[PDB]
């Protein structure tokens, strides 16, 4: 879509609400990648079957995050994690959009953080939400833990009303790096947040914290698509706003859809990005 100058964004969004035009727009987002030769052979390989948290959520072959290969006794692939490189506001591969690790993929996850020089994780889920398992705890409750060759140590935790920051060290014990996790803890278990400011605030604090990071920021929720996508669009659009005073949700989203399936999974989430940014702009 066109870049909308911030001055006209509130009206653009009010007009979408009044015309009920979000449904049609989100419907073009959903079909925007069917003609591009995208494949997901790795995600569907029998060796990887237990590494996927959800059978309908795959990591496209061209943009999937590859792990280095190991030759193990079982002879099975080891280059695979359900995650994808995703572009940001004029920064190719600014994010890794990942599913929440399982117990069986926590070592893979840490190995991805090591091999891809990740220093920030953004987590937008609780572990269990109203009886639904969303994500396994992949970090030590207290002190230290080993996940294969990866030693994670929790140096400190700051708890705030809407998110928590955990400060870890990561070591590859086959040979320290700081990794900071921003964990948003108040996303409702259904729907989208009723109030956008806490989410805005989280996004801004995270963005400060990653502002000099040389490698990608890992973003996950449970499937790594809906809430993950919503964060990615918010973060990138706050950058667009600051640097060009414009917003382009529709075009940006269509582009990242080529990198990972279902990023911004629901129309509600699409709408919530727009409402959150109107609010941001109006103060």
| Site for Br ion, rule CB under 5 A | 63, 85, 102, 136, 149, 221-222
Site of tokens 């992949």:
138
- Cα end-to-end distance, the chain, whole Å: 24
**Minimum distance from CB of 170 to Br ion (Å)?**
12
Identity of the residue, 61 or 136, whose beta carbon is nearer to Br ion in the bound complex: 136
Where is the binding site for substrate, in residues?
A: 189, 221-227, 265
Identity of the residue, 38 or 165, whose beta carbon is nearer to Br ion in the bound complex: 38
Bridge partners, 246 (sequence order): 5
DSSP alpha helix (H) spans, the chain: 9-18, 22-31, 41-44, 106-115, 197-209, 226-244, 249-257, 267-282
Q: Name residues whose C-beta falls within 8 Å of residue 69's C-beta, 6 or more positions apart in sequence.
A: 77, 78, 79
Of the listed 221, 232, 234, 241, which one is catalytic?
221
Does the annotation count 135 as an active-site position?
Answer: no
**Minimum distance from CB of 103 to Br ion (Å)?**
6
Identity of the residue, 149 or 153, whose beta carbon is nearer to Br ion in the bound complex: 149
**Minimum distance from CB of 118 to Br ion (Å)?**
15
Where is the binding site, in residues?
A: 189, 221-227, 265
**Minimum distance from CB of 226 to Br ion (Å)?**
5
Identity of the residue, 66 or 204, whose beta carbon is nearer to Br ion in the bound complex: 66
- Write the secondary structure of 59-111 as one string of H (helix), E (strand) and C (coil): CCCCCEEECCCCCCCCCCCCCEEEEEEEEECCEEEEEEEECCCCHHHHHHHHH
- Active-site residue numbers? 221
């Amino acid at each position: 879509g066109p870049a909308i100058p911030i001055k006209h964004f509130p009206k653009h969004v009010a007009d979408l609400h009044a015309s009920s035009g979000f449904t049609e727009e989100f419907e073009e987002v959903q079909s925007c990648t069917v003609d591009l030769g995208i494949t997901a052979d790795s995600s569907n390989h029998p060796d990887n079957k237990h590494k996927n948290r959800y059978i309908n959520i795959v990591a496209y072959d061209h943009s999937r995050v590859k792990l280095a290969q190991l030759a193990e006794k079982d002879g099975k692939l080891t280059d695979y994690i359900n995650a994808n490189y995703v572009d940001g506001y004029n920064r190719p591969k600014a994010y890794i959009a990942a599913q929440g690790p399982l117990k069986s993929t926590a070592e893979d996850f840490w190995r991805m953080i090591w091999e891809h020089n990740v220093e920030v994780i953004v987590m937008i889920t609780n572990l269990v939400e109203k009886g639904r398992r969303k994500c396994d705890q992949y970090w030590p409750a207290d002190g230290s833990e080993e996940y294969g060759n990866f030693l994670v140590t929790q140096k400190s935790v700051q708890v705030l009303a809407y998110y928590t920051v955990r400060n870890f060290t990561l070591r590859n014990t086959k040979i320290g790096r700081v990794v900071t996790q921003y964990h948003y803890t108040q996303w409702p278990d259904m729907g989208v947040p009723e109030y956008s400011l806490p989410v805005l605030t989280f996004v801004r604090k995270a963005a400060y914290a990653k502002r000099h990071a040389v490698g990608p920021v890992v973003v996950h929720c449970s499937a790594g698509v809906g809430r993950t996508g919503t964060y990615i669009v918010l973060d990138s659009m706050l950058q667009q706003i600051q640097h060009e005073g414009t917003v382009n949700i529709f075009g940006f989203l269509k582009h990242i859809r080529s990198q990972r399936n279902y990023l911004v999974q629901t129309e509600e989430q699409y709408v919530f990005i727009h409402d959150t940014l109107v609010e941001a702009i109006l103060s």
